[PDB]
């Protein structure tokens, strides 16, 4: 829904209030998105490198 990025999608356990769309922690780094089709909170993890 416009929020574009790269990473790996995993299942989550956090709880959103019924009106948020995407969460974050600090310095504009999204870490949780809910899919509009099913309304389930997910988790974003940066794709591995080193």
């Amino acid at each position: 829904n416009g929020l574009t990025g790269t990473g790996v999608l995993t299942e989550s356990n956090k709880k959103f209030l019924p009106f948020q769309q995407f969460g974050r922690d600090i310095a504009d780094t999204t870490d949780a998105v809910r899919d509009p089709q099913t309304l389930e909170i997910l988790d974003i993890t940066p794709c591995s490198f080193g």
Binding site: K14, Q21, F22, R24
Partner: protein, 107 residues
Amino acid sequence: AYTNSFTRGVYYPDKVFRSSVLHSTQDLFLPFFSNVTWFHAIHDNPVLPFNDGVYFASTEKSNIIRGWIFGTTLDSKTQSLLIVNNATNVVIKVCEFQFCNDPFLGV
């Protein structure tokens, strides 16, 4: 009359989610410990300026407060929004209406 708004008027600025973090936001808020007017609906429906947002704190137990009317000239020349509660479902419209010196309701 005037009254002291102690700490009211804080709203969620965005739709993001955060957990246990101190965030500083610069936005439109009602200042803390401010002055607010106080009208009386006994023997008031005056015209009040908007001025880029407005608060509204209605504490009447009796179901008397019904709706609002917005506009820039309050005439059929320019569109005027209208919100009315039917006690079961709210109706909202935007098209013009002719101003009446005594706005009323009828069912």
